[PDB]
Amino acid sequence: VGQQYSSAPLRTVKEVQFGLFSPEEVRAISVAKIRFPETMDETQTRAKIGGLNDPRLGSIDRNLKCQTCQEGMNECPGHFGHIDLAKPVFHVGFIAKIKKVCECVCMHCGKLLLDEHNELMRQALAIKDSKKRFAAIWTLCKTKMVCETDVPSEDDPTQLVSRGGCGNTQPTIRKDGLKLVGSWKKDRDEPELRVLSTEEILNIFKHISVKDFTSLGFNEVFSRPEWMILTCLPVPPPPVRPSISFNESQRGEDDLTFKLADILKANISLETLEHNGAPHHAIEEAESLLQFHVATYMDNDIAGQPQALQKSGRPVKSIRARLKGKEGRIRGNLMGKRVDFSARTVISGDPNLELDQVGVPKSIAKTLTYPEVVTPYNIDRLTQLVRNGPNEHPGAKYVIRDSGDRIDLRYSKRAGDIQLQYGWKVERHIMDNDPVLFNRQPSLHKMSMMAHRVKVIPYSTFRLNLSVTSPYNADFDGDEMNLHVPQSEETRAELSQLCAVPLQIVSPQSNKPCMGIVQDTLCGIRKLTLRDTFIELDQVLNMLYWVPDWDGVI
Amino acid sequence: LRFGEMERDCMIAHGAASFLKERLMEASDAFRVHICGICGLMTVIAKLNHNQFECKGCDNKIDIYQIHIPYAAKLLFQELMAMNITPRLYTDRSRDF
Amino acid sequence: MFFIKDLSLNITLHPSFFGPRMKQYLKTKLLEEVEGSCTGKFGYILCVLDYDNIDIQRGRILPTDGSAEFNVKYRAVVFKPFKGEVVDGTVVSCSQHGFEVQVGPMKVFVTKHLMPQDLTFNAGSNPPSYQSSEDVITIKSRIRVKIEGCISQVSSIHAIGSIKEDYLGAI
Amino acid sequence: STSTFQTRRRRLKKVEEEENAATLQLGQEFQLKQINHQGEEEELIALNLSEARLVIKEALVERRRAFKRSQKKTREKELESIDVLLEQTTGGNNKDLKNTMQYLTNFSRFRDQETVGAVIQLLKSTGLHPFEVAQLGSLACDTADEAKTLIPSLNNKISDDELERILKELSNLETLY
Amino acid sequence: LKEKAIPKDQRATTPYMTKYERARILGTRALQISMNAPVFVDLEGETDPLRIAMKELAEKKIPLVIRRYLPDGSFEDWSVEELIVDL
Amino acid sequence: IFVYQNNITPSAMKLVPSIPPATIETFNEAALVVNITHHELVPKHIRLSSDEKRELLKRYRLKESQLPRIQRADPVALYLGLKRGEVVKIIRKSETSGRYASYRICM
Amino acid sequence: AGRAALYKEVYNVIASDGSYVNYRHMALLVDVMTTQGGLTSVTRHGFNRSNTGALMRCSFEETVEILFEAGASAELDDCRGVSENVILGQMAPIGTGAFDVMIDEESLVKYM
Amino acid sequence: RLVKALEDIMVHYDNTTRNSLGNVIQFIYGEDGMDAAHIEKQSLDTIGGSDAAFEKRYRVDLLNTDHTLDPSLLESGSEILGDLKLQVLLDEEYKQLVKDRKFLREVFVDGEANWPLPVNIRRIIQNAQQTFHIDHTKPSDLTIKDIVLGVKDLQENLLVLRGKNEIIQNAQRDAVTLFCCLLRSRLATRRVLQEYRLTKQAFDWVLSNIEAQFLRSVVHPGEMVGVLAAQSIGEPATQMTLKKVTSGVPRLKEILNVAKNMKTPSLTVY
DNA sequence: TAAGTACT
RNA sequence: UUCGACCAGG
DNA sequence: AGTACTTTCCGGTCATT
Ligand SMILES: [Mg+2]
Ligand SMILES: [Zn+2]
Ligand SMILES: [Zn+2]
Ligand SMILES: [Zn+2]
């Protein structure tokens, strides 16, 4: 899969280490400065500017170059780029914590608000479970709002012991949109409301202690709180935000490719204010804009209404949105995909197929293909199929040699020619008796999917045996069904040795068989029973002949 | 056609292990990426010709694996990275158990 | 300096060779992909010792093609120069920028200005050399060098060395 | 490539790659304390030329042997004798091994697996680190200075006189030509 | 790792081959056979791999080994040869 | 063991965990009017020696966590008075095989 | 005894219909629901919060919400989960793959 | 939901039911290690029936002209009557069948004796029957030791778990108990000879089969039980097309939701 | 649709 | 490709 | 403490971008 040999050893993923990107890493990794917000047109001249998409990053226009990495398009996954922000921004999805963390530590000095000294704390420092420490710790220090400098140790409440210092009262905190604001109580009276600048928060975090990280659900190497705040922004490469070209002289840019375009814009404009007419706080009116975009870019289904509609009123697909359940990556692209070597038509009963069979229409059998590997055992038979062509039925439509190259049997000036080579593969037609997985959705049974014997038949319908009807739970009032074709010698095995209908006969969901006899066959098997019912020679003879395994003994 | 969730669950029930994978990879996605044996990322600048491999930053050129995963997955991952989250791909367990 | 490190390697064998003397083929291939290798972490792999008791262990069958993968554990003779290491080899090429000594499977080079001063460089010589008051360095002349620095590369290793210290030069 | 008996748990931040110098600080892959396949520990393995010339030959030889159980089913004099052992049990395209035996066979300092034995038994009473215990064996030294200078890792590990005696007993075992 | 490798004695699992096991042994073997691997039984004229395998498997002449992992990681090793094949 | 009638003062109870090793438990009368262990449903449990436990584990190759658990305040957990770490063996009847052996550690 | 009820109840639900399910199943579920400690619900509120990996829980009702706090708390995934591997394109340790297969070179010689 | 919640659950080679953490969920799949597929509603004859009938059927007394096996059944009939060393096994048996009675009546209070159990014994003998053209006329050839001692030697092999220790080999006994009861129920001396005239041949056969047949009905380490059970419940859940309680579907929902406020709360006090 | 949380 | 609607069906 | 909000499985059309 992928094609082209790589002297790179191959392995399977065993662990997935979840972490957060450190502004320094994001940089090291990147291969793109990403300074301009434009797409291309070096003054209309078509290509790409060393600005956004491909300032060395991936490519388009069917052209090798991927930083000489060549290979071009298919094979060169993306190469992240970055884009140095102007000023720190929250991480739309992290705000929650970032906030809940401050409520756990006081600024100025930045350190815990409850040491081993407070006993209710001890118990909350033994619980081994990041999710639970931080869910008890928080509950304990969200109340105390005074960075205690002296507390009564494990002895007299009279004697006061010392630790860190700076009682600077702790302001309670609330969430308004994408910013954190808190009030500092002053006694003597009346509050003191001020906005907590990211630049500030970030700092208080950078200083949080090493053991303090950990104590609170974090990790010194993979996720330091101080990273929940974005300094550098990784820039997904084309393949994540591909285009769609209507030949040439037109457009086709992807949603994402725009929010960056914005994020980028709204960044520069900020910068060009801190080195010019800087009316001090007529900037934080344009810094909220970056905190906005760089927030929405990731999540756009927030509580603070403003959907950030894109000119036309279309919502805007946020990254988060792409993964969100169903119809989405995780659940729709990974946990379940569309697949090749599959077919579906209308099912109809046929009292002439053995139970484990399935009627496949030539039409399809000539479409679906099974890759066979040229072996001295078949060579002959295979070569015949190849010659036969991809039009006659028992035949094939693709011969592929070691040299990773496909011979298209329907065009190739040598179609008629060709001598096979032990080791070559000959995608052939599905033949009478190739195990397949047949099925009828909704699949809520082991049995909703069983392995059958392919039986190529005329006319356009999957013709399944009647008794295997109730397990798929299907009628023929127009009911459709799916058929998947195995691909590796060992794959088949898995169907035939575990999925074959004859096997599914007795079901564990009810320790009783799950297929029987219905309609005519049943109804008729009663009539044909009755004492009252007798049959004469002429016929008793044919009936015998019908049972295929009749020992020939009238 | 589609081999949606339910269809999977069935194979899982059947224990038809390999098959499941086959539907999921060979007959669909299936893709080959390279990694840094160090920082479990897709960084790797594989020139698959002059065998060069690099990965400045984690700066390698020696410890590099090659893996097979559903392109959709690679995406899942890249999409996650653009969200500044890191999914590490390691070829060996170190947490035992 | 020459070492005998314990290494291991994984070879993916195609069902093809799942014969009777598979053990054989494996070993054989082990050799094809090692004896002659070069790394920074192992340097020059020169020879597999104890050819006979080469451990193969049970190899496992991958899972889409019969190919099997055995972790062939072996032991062999290595050599990876170091900075500050003192070795003597035989000169090969010599130019107006210095001569190149060949300490074993490796080639250590010495800069004209990384030697002494009383040693100049004679051009119109045949073969080309470097003359002194009493010494003469050319082709076959054996030298003893102090490897100042090492530079790993591709499937080889080079290094620059000096002969400016004491107890260094010809012999 | 070819792994080396010791899975060092690399947790992301690979940055501390110390220098390489005769400060006996060899790449982590050559600590005095390395691991043997059996899973046991074992002192590093330092081979001085001519002692190596013998290990290689000893296997390159016993290879030709087990290469025929299955086949059924003087200085300039050793240059020729070895060239063959190669063109029989080597890859032929291992131009390194070729050149490694020339060098290894030219600058070698011993011919008997008995002489090389004593060399060892000798230097192996020093308590010295393998790498030194090699250089001493493959480098001619007349003085404690020529020595304690071309192996600066010695400097304080052994009195000049002592090291001098050893050097004496070497040129004394040094086989002729 | 060998502390995670259980001895041939002290062995515990089912003396019989699991249906998944055989299912895979046959498949796997078939594949290899179809790859032009070596066949250890006289092909009584058989030419279909999974067919051959079914044969190799009944003359218990399959050079494979099923390594049964345990929840904790330690495994047991069995050979198609040993394993009883009821079904 | 202290049996209160209608309740104890929150000022009081905060004096039980102040004299280890020893331990104290609080039970309401109204909750002991009937023995729950006598209920058709509740099967008989059993404490396990720190010996019988270090065994159970070794014989299943289990880590403490993979073991099924019982609440520290569980009605029966109190009736027997378990302690964070003690293991209970639950032996009940079964319509599939007369008796079934289950284990419940404590959190 | 709670279990005993939770089961008894679920069972009655299936019996009212005149259907039948072999203990074991209702049992298993009724157990998964209990073991943990008390009544762990078959919903995004319960089970999909346990110690199980991220990528797994990730595929059911909270996805991103979940993935986010996975990197934040530097979670480590075993990839023992069925789902886990389905997502990676690897063979899941399930029946057919609950074990490994090897060519025993030894036995591979007596066979000739 | 039901599915996603149990995917990861399967039977591991030790015969335990766990998930991805390895957290035991069932120590023996279904409290018995038998694969659902191999099971049929059999009847534990030992349960129902009057204390009177019970004797007339399973009681054998070699010390009595009216409570001994008539020599018309066993070959060594007359030469047994009275023997005292036999009436010890013959009484050991009975005291057990009796322990059985009381045991079952402590598990299945309802009295219902028809339950799902691996290995259909009824048929296994039925075959034994017409397979050896056994004539209900002439006498058997089983010693009394033959029978009783072999049945005991049978239970020894119905292994579900294998382990080489007490803890384990103790569970063994457990996860088999019920079955054996059914086993002893149908292989008690009187029965074995008076109801189904077995010959030494037939019997040794009936045994062999039960053993083998049982060993097949075990569960296969590999079976992804979770998903299975999931469906098995959520399947007959869709076929639900619809005394004044909460009902089906909505209720089941109510149950999986672990809801505090259930439409119907009720409570039956005896 | 109907239930369950989290949120105002 | 996407959003939306509709539909259409099992 | 109450009210609103958010969170079944599977062809072709039109319309817009
Ligand atoms: Mg219909
Ligand atoms: Zn590229
Ligand atoms: Zn402070
Ligand atoms: Zn890297």
User: Mind giving me the DSSP string for H24-82?
Assistant: -SBSSGGGT-B-TTS-EEEE-TTSSS-HHHHHHHH---SS-SSSS--TTTSTT-TTTTT
Could E24 and B15 be called an inter-chain contact, meaning their C-beta atoms sit closer than 8 Å?
A: no
- Domain containing C164 — which CATH number? 2.40.50.140
Closest protein residue to K8 (Cα–C1')? A442
Residue of chain G with shortest Cα separation from H4: G60
Residue B49 three-state SS: coil
Q: Which chains touch E (3 or more CB pairs under 8 A)?
A: A, B, C, F, G, H
Q: Could you tell me if C165 and C116 lie in one domain?
A: yes
User: Given CA atoms F68, F73, F75, F78 in this order, what sign does their dihedral have?
Assistant: positive
How far apart (Å, rounded) are the C-alpha atoms in residues H115 and H127? 22
Amino acid at residue number H172: Q
Could B12 and H227 be called an inter-chain contact, meaning their C-beta atoms sit closer than 8 Å?
A: yes
Residues contributing to the annotated binding site of B for Zn(2+): 36, 39, 55, 58
Tokens encoding C67: 């190919």
* A341-367+431-504 CATH pick, 2.40.40.20, 2.60.40.420, 2.40.50.140, 3.90.110.10: 2.40.40.20
Q: How far, in Å, are H79, H96, H101, H129, H139 from residue H193 at the CA level?
A: 16, 19, 21, 12, 9
How far apart (Å, rounded) are the C-alpha atoms in residues A144 and E25? 65
- Domain containing F48 — which CATH number? 3.90.940.20
Could H7 and G81 be called an inter-chain contact, meaning their C-beta atoms sit closer than 8 Å?
A: yes
Give the distance from residue G102's alpha carbon to the nearest chain C alpha carbon, in angstroms: 4
3-class secondary structure per residue, F63-87: CHHHCCEECCCCHHHHHHCCCECEC
Q: Could you tell me if C135 and C70 lie in one domain?
A: no
**Domains of chain D with CATH codes:** 1-46 (no CATH), 47-71+74-177 (1.20.1250.40)
Pairing of strands A461-464, A369-373: unpaired
Verify if strand J has an atom below 7 Å from the CB of A61.
no
Q: Which residue has tokens 């756990």?
A: A104
How far apart (Å, rounded) are the C-alpha atoms in residues C99 and C120? 12
Residue of chain H with shortest Cα separation from G5: H255
What residues in C contact B18, CB-CB < 8 Å? 63-64
Instruction: Output DSSP code: residue A29.
Output: H
Method: X-ray
Under CATH, to which class is A368-430 assigned? alpha beta
How far apart (Å, rounded) are the C-alpha atoms in residues A37 and A149? 51
Whether D67 and D45 have beta carbons less than 8 Å apart is answered as: no
Whether H58 and H97 have beta carbons less than 8 Å apart is answered as: yes
Q: Could you tell me if C165 and C142 lie in one domain?
A: yes
**Angle C36-C40-C46 from CA coordinates, rounded to 5°:** 25
How far apart (Å, rounded) are the C-alpha atoms in residues C82 and D29? 13
- Domain containing C34 — which CATH number? 3.30.1490.120
Q: Return the closest-CA partner of residue E81 out of E58, E54, E47.
A: E58
Burial class (CB in 10 A: 0-12, 13-18, 19+), D62: middle
Burial class (CB in 10 A: 0-12, 13-18, 19+), A387: middle
Amino acid at residue number H262: M
Q: In Å, how far from its chain's centre is CA F88?
A: 7
Residues contributing to the annotated binding site of B: 36, 39, 55, 58
| Count of structural domains, chain C | 2
Domain positions in chain B? 1-85
Pairing of strands A396-401, A405-408: antiparallel
Residue of chain G with shortest Cα separation from A334: G87
Q: What is the helix (H) or strand (E) element at residue H88, kind and residue range? A: helix H86-107
* Side-chain half-sphere CA neighbours of B7 within 13 A: 24
User: Mind giving me the DSSP string for A216-259?
Assistant: TT-BTTTB-GGGSSEEE--B--GGGS----SSSSS----SHHHH
Q: What is the helix (H) or strand (E) element at residue H116, kind and residue range? A: strand H114-117
Domain span holding position C134: 83-171
How far apart (Å, rounded) are the C-alpha atoms in residues A518 and E64? 45
Domain span holding position F85: 35-107
- Output the CA B42–ligand 4 centroid distance in Å: 8
Q: Which residues contact A374 (CB under 8 A, 6 or more apart)?
A: A382, A420, A421, A422, A423, A424, A425, A426
Tokens encoding H71: 């020599």
Q: Which residue has tokens 């000049």?
A: D160
Chains B and C touch (3+ CB pairs under 8 A): yes
Q: Could you tell me if C89 and C78 lie in one domain?
A: no
- F32-47 burial, b at 16+ Cβ within 10 Å, e below that, comes to eeeeeeeeeebbebee
Q: Return the closest-CA partner of residue B8 out of F61, H121, A232, A331.
A: A331
Q: Which residues contact F107 (CB under 8 A, 6 or more apart)?
A: F69, F70, F71, F72, F84, G37
> Residue E28: which of C14, C16, C61 has the nearest Cβ?
C61
Q: Could you tell me if C57 and C90 lie in one domain?
A: no
Amino acid at residue number A484: H
Q: Could you tell me if C1 and C61 lie in one domain?
A: yes
Instruction: Output DSSP code: residue C171.
Output: -
User: Mind giving me the DSSP string for A99-160?
Assistant: HHHHTTEETTTTEES--TTSHHHHHTTT---HHHHTTTHHHHHTT--S--SEE--SS-SSS-
User: Given CA atoms A118, A120, A121, A125 in this order, what sign does their dihedral have?
Assistant: positive
* H helical segments located in A337-392: 362-365, 379-388
Q: Could you tell me if C77 and C95 lie in one domain?
A: no
Verify if strand K has an atom below 7 Å from the CB of G65.
no
Whether G9 and G34 have beta carbons less than 8 Å apart is answered as: no
Nearest nucleotide to the CA of B3, by C1', is: K10
How far apart (Å, rounded) are the C-alpha atoms in residues A521 and D120? 93
Q: Return the closest-CA partner of residue A90 out of A296, A267, A245.
A: A296
Residues pairing with C169 in the sheet = C144
Experimental structure resolution, Å = 4.0
Q: Which residue has tokens 């008890």?
A: A136
Instruction: Output DSSP code: residue A334.
Output: I
Could G92 and B21 be called an inter-chain contact, meaning their C-beta atoms sit closer than 8 Å?
A: yes
Residues pairing with A439 in the sheet = A449, A482
Verify if strand K has an atom below 7 Å from the CB of B2.
yes
Tokens encoding A113: 């608000």
**Angle H25-H27-H28 from CA coordinates, rounded to 5°:** 115
- CA Rg, chain A, in Å? 35
Verify if strand K has an atom below 7 Å from the CB of B92.
no
Query: Cis ω on the peptide bond leading into residue H116 (within 30° of 0)?
Result: no
Q: Return the closest-CA partner of residue A139 out of A174, A110, A170, A103.
A: A103
**Domains of chain E with CATH codes:** 1-87 (3.90.940.10)
Q: Could you tell me if C76 and C109 lie in one domain?
A: no
How far apart (Å, rounded) are the C-alpha atoms in residues B59 and B44? 9
User: Mind giving me the DSSP string for A270-311?
Assistant: HHTTTTS---GGGSTTTSHHHHHHHHHTT----SS-----BT
Whether A216 and A101 have beta carbons less than 8 Å apart is answered as: yes
Tokens encoding A157: 């409440």
Give the distance from residue B42's alpha carbon to the nearest chain C alpha carbon, in angstroms: 23
Verify if strand K has an atom below 7 Å from the CB of B5.
yes
- Boundary-marking domain end, from C45, C60, C82: C82
> Which CATH architecture describes the domain B1-85?
Alpha-Beta Complex (3.90)
Tokens encoding A547: 């049972």
> Residue B97: which of E24, E27, E73 has the nearest Cβ?
E73
Q: Which residue has tokens 């515990």?
A: E12
